[PDB]
Amino acid sequence: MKGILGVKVGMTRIFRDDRAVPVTVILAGPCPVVQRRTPEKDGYTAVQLGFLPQNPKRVNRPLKGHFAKAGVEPVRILREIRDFNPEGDTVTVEIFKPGERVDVTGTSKGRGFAGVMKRWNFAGGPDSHGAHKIHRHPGSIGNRKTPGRVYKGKKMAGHYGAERVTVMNLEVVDVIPEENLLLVKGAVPGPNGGLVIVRETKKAA
């Protein structure tokens, strides 16, 4: 029921314990509280967090510099963490000692048009024997004159990549609050240089 923003840093292997660890590190960044959300006036429960302060002339207009507390804008907008309500402060990492697995929600790298082969993982055919014609084709679809049609959501030759992906449950290896680091078990969607948020997971009760 917790959360904080961040950005993708490394992926390495810290020789913690005596076991190597593929470790995504995430610069969680000092993401300030701002325009809060209640269910009386909005209809849910969330908090707005802007990422990294880099904003002057090129920001312009409203600002929640207005809000009541300012801070201008980050450099790349703010996001809403559901079920969240701090206590009137800015937040970075400290709210998570190690031992606290969390889901990590981030954007995903884009593969443009994906061939059906490298999307839903198909065979394509034989490396000779038959015809070189198909070779890497999605085979056939539905039956003859009945169905009579094709299936809405049939695994097909289309797009794959520029998507939103939430990964689930990873041991928070350690927290560096002296800067802005949050190192957990390696995974995390997207490039080594794109936005990614942290949210507390669901396991026991």
Work out how close the CB of 84 gets to another protein at its nearest, in angstroms, rounded to a whole number. Answer: 23
Binders of another protein: how many residues, by CB under 8 A?
A: 26
Would you count residue 109 as binding another protein (CB under 8 A)?
Answer: yes
- Range 114-173, binding another protein (CB under 8 A): 161
The partner in contact with residue 1, picked from another protein, RNA, none with C-beta cut-offs of 5 to 8 angstroms by kind, is none
Smallest gap from residue 94 Cβ to another protein (A): 17
From 183, 196, 197, 198, residue interacting with another protein (rule: CB under 8 A): 183
Least spacing, CB of residue 178 vs RNA, in Å = 19
Task: Provide CB contacts within 8 A for 73, sequence distance 6+.
Answer: 50, 53, 55, 59, 63, 64, 65
User: How far apart, in whole angstroms, are the C-alpha atoms of residue 162 and residue 94?
Assistant: 32
CB of 96 to another protein, least distance (A): 16
Q: Please give the Cα distance from 137 to 173 (Å, whole number).
A: 44
Q: Smaller CB distance to another protein: residue 27 or 46?
A: 27
Nearer to another protein, 110 or 130 (CB): 110
Beta-bridged to residue 79, according to DSSP, are 49
Considering only 14-22, 62-70, 121-129, 138-146, which stretch makes contact with another protein by CB under 8 A? 14-22
Partner in contact with 97, chosen from another protein, RNA, none, beta carbon below 5 to 8 Å by kind: none
* E strands in the chain: 3-4, 7-9, 23-27, 31-37, 46-50, 78-82, 90-91, 102-107, 164-167, 172-176, 181-185, 196-200
Dig out the tokens for 163 from the structure.
């998507």
Cis before 147 (ω within 30): yes
DSSP-based helix, strand, coil % in the chain, nearest 5: 0, 30, 70
Closest contact distance (angstroms) between CB of 15 and RNA is 11
- Binding partner of residue 69 among another protein, RNA, none, CB under 5 to 8 Å per kind? none
Q: Which of 18, 87, 89, 127 binds another protein (CB under 8 A)?
A: 18
